[PDB]
Amino acid sequence: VLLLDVTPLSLGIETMGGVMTTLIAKNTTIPTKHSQVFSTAEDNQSAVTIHVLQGERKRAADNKSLGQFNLDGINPAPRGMPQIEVTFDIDADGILHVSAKDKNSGKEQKITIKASSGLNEDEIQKMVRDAEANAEADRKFEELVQTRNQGDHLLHSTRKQVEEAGDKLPADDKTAIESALTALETALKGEDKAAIEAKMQELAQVSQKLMEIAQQQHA
Amino acid sequence: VLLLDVTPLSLGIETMGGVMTTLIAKNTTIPTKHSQVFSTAEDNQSAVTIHVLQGERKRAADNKSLGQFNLDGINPAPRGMPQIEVTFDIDADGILHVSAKDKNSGKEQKITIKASSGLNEDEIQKMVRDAEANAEADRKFEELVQTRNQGDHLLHSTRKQVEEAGDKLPADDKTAIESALTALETALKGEDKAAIEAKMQELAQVSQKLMEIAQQQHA
């Protein structure tokens, strides 16, 4: 072949923290199909918004929006338990089919994106260009979002563990733990990575007795 | 400057599933310092092995081993709760300092890696070469390890949720759930991604009542 049709830009979805998660890597030859199983951000979340993105930037907002759609009817569950499988299928005509399917309920919703949608050749080059021009800033944003996402996980896991602990947890421990949880929740509202890591650190320092009770409860 | 000293290969650690997690990206100009907060794979894990890797391959075994060391004295905790912060610092002399620090106990262990350690120029080119030659296989292995790691998370979270549920969980539900958990544990022993995803799917289909009880317990 003298020619290949290839993706000029990565393709994916917006995930928690406002980042782009790539399902199809830049310069993939089509037809191609990739899928990944995602889950929910919130306890008892009934729906997920599937925001389809084209671009090379870490921040979702910095990429091209190809469109979006929701999948609802998600049954009550703890965050991170539902299995929402997201498939990007680009066919021989260059049409992108995106689906989101709930493996519990079997419910599925799709968006179809025409071969001609997305960024034109100029904008593509502008995008490849900006992604190299901002590689460092994007890397910093990835580290921030990853830190906030971890701290959110610690926030929530710890709160569940406090509840499960009940009276097993000494009063002084609970005082120290909740004040650290409150401060971590606040730090998670900003974009100061150092701040988040300092509250996470505080929580690790004050939670030892709680870790031991939680480890024991499921031992 | 007519010259820059740059990393010819990515640098990182082996993490669960036998993958390389990069802390310092290929072609980073030094001095540079990056850190990431990791946690434990197992409930009540007392120590983490820090296996320092140089290379571009997804599989840890496919990279160059720069050495390794353990950090122990991790206090009893559920998997994923301890905060083990891992820092790669390359100084002006090109010496790599790797540390692992437990944010609960403050305990820290280090390895120092000489500028001359790692792959020689030949082997570097062999490595850049193999990583492009195996890009597709490495991508497949990443998808497998990511799937097994998710399924392990579902396995373990679900088992905890069963215990916390107690008699709230109907007998027929518990029968279906445990048989699916057993089958998922078995699938997680292999390297058949389809198999793992099929057991995960089974668990999502049979766990609805359990998700609802768990969502309610912390509502």
Partner: peptide, 7 residues
Amino acid sequence: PVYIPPP
């Protein structure tokens, strides 16, 4: 798994 926010 990576998480997706609600609508």
